[PDB]
Paper text:
[name] harbors an N-terminal catalytic GIY-YIG endonuclease domain followed by a C-terminal zinc finger motif. Individual [name] has very weak nuclease activity, while association with [name] could dramatically enhance its enzymatic activity. [name] C-terminal zinc finger and [name] C-terminal helix-turn-helix domain are well conserved throughout evolution, and have been mapped out to be the minimal fragment of each protein required for the complex formation. Here, we report the crystal structure of the [name] [name] C-terminal [name] finger domain in complex with [name] C-terminal four-helix bundle domain, which provides structural insights into the [name]-[name] complex formation.
Residue numbers in the entry:
A (entry chain A): 178 to 246
B (entry chain B): 349 to 417
């Protein structure tokens, strides 16, 4: 699987963000997506961001569907 | 808020986000608690000396969970 922001491969053991809408399913590294969402250099935790593929504006948590399960 | 304190808070964020070891950032991005004492040592290894008070205030301000808290 390829990260859609940095184009490096995402390993099988690696956590990864995905847009929770199956019609989109944009996949990317957590750090890559977070970096794209951050608005100032002191910030480390995104609040919300626009999925670059479907353009929906979602909260950070929404991208974590596979992280905890 | 203090402009000068935020310069040190910014340095902590920069280390988290710029270190080759991205494990701390991944913890933050997945709402996993950080051991403050371990984090202080981790920062020290990355050429960053900061107090536990600076770490606690940074965590509180930027959304990082602390073990024991
Ligand atoms: Zn990536
Ligand atoms: Zn999407």
């Amino acid at each position: 699987v390829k990260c859609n922001l940095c184009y490096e491969c995402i390993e099988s053991d690696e956590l990864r963000a995905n847009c929770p809408f199956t019609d989109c399913n944009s996949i990317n590294h957590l750090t890559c997506l977070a970096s794209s969402f951050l608005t100032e250099e002191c910030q480390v935790l995104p609040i919300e961001g626009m999925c670059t593929k479907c353009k929906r504006v979602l909260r950070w948590r929404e991208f974590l569907s596979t992280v905890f399960t | 808020g203090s402009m000068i304190v935020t310069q040190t808070h910014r340095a902590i964020s920069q280390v988290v986000k710029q270190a080759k070891d991205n494990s701390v950032w991944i913890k933050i991005l997945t709402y996993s608690a950080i051991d403050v004492e371990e984090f202080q040592l981790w920062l020290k290894r990355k050429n960053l000396n900061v107090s536990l008070d600076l770490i606690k205030s940074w965590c509180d301000k930027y959304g990082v969970l602390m073990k024991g808290s």
